[PDB]
Design a protein around this ligand. Structure first.
Ligand SMILES: C[C@H](CCC(=O)NCCC[N+](C)(C)C[C@@H](O)CS(=O)(=O)O)[C@H]1CC[C@H]2[C@@H]3[C@H](O)C[C@@H]4C[C@H](O)CC[C@]4(C)[C@H]3C[C@H](O)[C@]12C
Ligand SMILES: C[C@H](CCC(=O)NCCC[N+](C)(C)C[C@H](O)CS(=O)(=O)O)[C@H]1CC[C@H]2[C@@H]3[C@H](O)C[C@@H]4C[C@H](O)CC[C@]4(C)[C@H]3C[C@H](O)[C@]12C
Ligand SMILES: C[C@H](CCC(=O)NCCC[N+](C)(C)C[C@H](O)CS(=O)(=O)O)[C@H]1CC[C@H]2[C@@H]3[C@H](O)C[C@@H]4C[C@H](O)CC[C@]4(C)[C@H]3C[C@H](O)[C@]12C
Ligand SMILES: C[C@H](CCC(=O)NCCC[N+](C)(C)C[C@H](O)CS(=O)(=O)O)[C@H]1CC[C@H]2[C@@H]3[C@H](O)C[C@@H]4C[C@H](O)CC[C@]4(C)[C@H]3C[C@H](O)[C@]12C
Ligand SMILES: C[C@H](CCC(=O)NCCC[N+](C)(C)C[C@H](O)CS(=O)(=O)O)[C@H]1CC[C@H]2[C@@H]3[C@H](O)C[C@@H]4C[C@H](O)CC[C@]4(C)[C@H]3C[C@H](O)[C@]12C
Ligand SMILES: Nc1ncnc2c1ncn2[C@@H]1O[C@H](CSCC[C@H](N)C(=O)O)[C@@H](O)[C@H]1O
Ligand code: SF4
Ligand code: FES
Ligand SMILES: [Cl-]
Ligand SMILES: [Cl-]
Ligand SMILES: [Cl-]
Length: 346
């Protein structure tokens, strides 16, 4: 019964069987009830504050060749850019001036900056009295250590898929074992550590999605970023089907249920595949939003997937826009850095 699955979720009986059935049931009533449960749990554990993480996509140069990603090295159609360290620091300062309490630095795996230019940048941004989150991909332990010493607070490294066979096929430079080792290293070093997966990858099954949920719960990640796969025309996966918004939303809801005190963004990919998708996601378990703070003329060039929202707007538009979103949702902007606030339970 949908009714029995909801009761087991409410009682925290998170068996493989319960999660598979939750993801397999297509009934509208069941889905709505699941979204309501996640929404309620979010309210109870993390409150009405929506934390704003200003993201600066500072380089689209990448050495890897992930089959899903528009920044993959084999994509010759893309104009490559790199922000200078001064540009990055000053752009972070402008986000802080606009009220950002977390700055996220994200890039392709661009060797140019690694490790010392990142360290220099992180040091300068930390002077501004804000949290710094890095999302730079897979690097040696020594680089992660240097960045932590430089003052980085958090690291986002989506695990993408917990199916090691699918992972190796989609990410042929690397492996799930490497990705996990990175995540474990980040945790050991004391970063708030973010993982998460794509939904609707070619060949990905419902059992795979279950495994993603169990993987997330197992490692107790501080942040979980989940979005639909969106095919990019300049990649090998150009002709594959996009991920389903409602199934993705169910993944976000179940993540909240499983990790009630975690930070969970309403990802840009959710807002890209459905108009208003971020706002829906914020009402089904999510409590974080990541406004695009990449400056013109580079915004339009950070093309992980096509159609990406916000790319045409003036490059200071997204912080005020998300403040409006948060108000019209009946929510509040985050007051502090929005670090994970653990609720220890049974
Ligand atoms: C806005 C939308 C249509 C509502 C509607 O128009 N009803 C008809 C009018 C209802 N009333 C209350 C304004 C008046 C009626 O009482 C009287 S009458 O209909 O005018 O006669 C309703 C219908 C189903 C609702 C979602 C689901 O729950 C799941 C989920 C639960 C979370 O917790 C919050 C988010 C989600 C996505 C919800 C959001 C929103 O809430 C939805 C989309
Ligand atoms: C209550 C309201 C007026 C209906 C009427 O004219 N009388 C009708 C008109 C348009 C309807 C929404 C849309 O379909 C989109 C969506 C479809 C999903 O399946 C269920 C949810 C959504 C949000 C719907 C809710 C509700 O049903 C709406 C608000
Ligand atoms: C940067 C700029 C010049 C002054 C300055 O440098 N202030 C630094 C302020 C540092 N704070 C945010 C830490 C305070 C100031 C002057 C007016 C300020 C906006 C308005 O208030 C409205 C709105 C309030 C929200 O809450 C945050 C967003 C908004 C859009 C603000 C952003 C920014 O703040 C503005 C542009
Ligand atoms: C209008 C739009 C097509 C354009 C479709 C695509 C995805 C649809 C939403 C999702 O299914 C989740 C959720 C299910 C609930 O049952 C009713 C509310 C929700 C928010 C849906 C409303 C609506 O139907 C959406 C936005
Ligand atoms: C300048 C811009 C137009 C408007 C649109 C939404 C407004 C915010 C919300 O009202 C909530 C809150 C009060 C303070 C907050 C953050 C506001 C600042 C500013 O007033 C905003 C950004
Ligand atoms: N085609 C696509 N559809 C949806 N999300 C995608 C995508 N291509 C990439 N992404 C998402 O974008 C995230 C940021 S990629 C940039 C950070 C770093 N290079 C890294 O790989 O971790 C990825 O983790 C992936 O989940
Ligand atoms: S997902 Fe990250 S590592 Fe892979 S190609 Fe895209 S930017 Fe490079
Ligand atoms: S969040 Fe980018 S314009 Fe609305
Ligand atoms: Cl963050
Ligand atoms: Cl994310
Ligand atoms: Cl995304």
């Amino acid at each position: 019964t949908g009714r029995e699955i909801l009761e087991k979720l409410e009682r925290r009986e998170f068996t493989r069987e319960v999660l598979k059935e939750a993801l397999s049931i297509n009934d509208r009533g069941f889905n709505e009830a699941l979204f309501k449960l996640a929404d309620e749990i979010r309210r109870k554990y993390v409150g009405d504050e929506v934390h704003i993480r200003a993201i600066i996509e500072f380089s689209n140069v990448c050495r890897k060749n992930c089959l899903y990603c528009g920044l993959r090295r084999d994509n010759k159609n893309l104009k490559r850019y790199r922000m200078t360290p001064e540009e990055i620091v000053e752009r972070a300062r402008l986000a802080v001036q606009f009220g950002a309490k977390t700055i996220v630095l994200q890039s392709g795996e661009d060797p140019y900056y690694m490790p010392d230019v990142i360290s220099d940048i992180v040091k300068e941004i930390k002077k501004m009295g804000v949290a710094v989150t890095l999302s730079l991909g897979e690097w040696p332990r020594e680089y992660y250590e240097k960045w932590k010493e430089a003052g980085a607070d958090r690291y986002l490294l989506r695990h993408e898929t917990a199916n090691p066979v699918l992972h190796r096929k989609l990410r042929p430079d690397t492996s799930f074992e490497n990705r996990l080792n990175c995540l474990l290293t980040l945790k050991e070093l004391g970063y708030e550590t973010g993982a998460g997966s794509m939904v609707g990858l070619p060949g990905q099954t419902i059992d795979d999605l279950v495994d993603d949920l169990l993987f997330l719960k197992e490692h107790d990640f501080d942040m979980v970023g989940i979005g639909p796969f969106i095919p990019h025309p300049d990649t090998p996966l150009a002709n594959e089907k996009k991920g389903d918004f409602t199934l993705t939303l169910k993944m976000v809801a179940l993540t909240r249920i499983l990790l009630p005190d975690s930070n969970i963004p309403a990802t840009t990919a959710m807002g890209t595949i459905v108009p208003g998708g971020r706002e829906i996601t914020l009402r089904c378990g999510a409590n974080v939003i990541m406004p695009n703070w990449t400056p013109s003329p580079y915004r339009q060039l950070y093309q992980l997937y096509p159609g990406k929202i916000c790319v045409f707007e003036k490059d200071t538009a997204c912080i005020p826009c998300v403040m409006k979103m948060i108000e019209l949702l009946g929510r509040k902007p985050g007051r502090d850095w929005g670090g994970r606030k653990r609720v220890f339970e049974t």
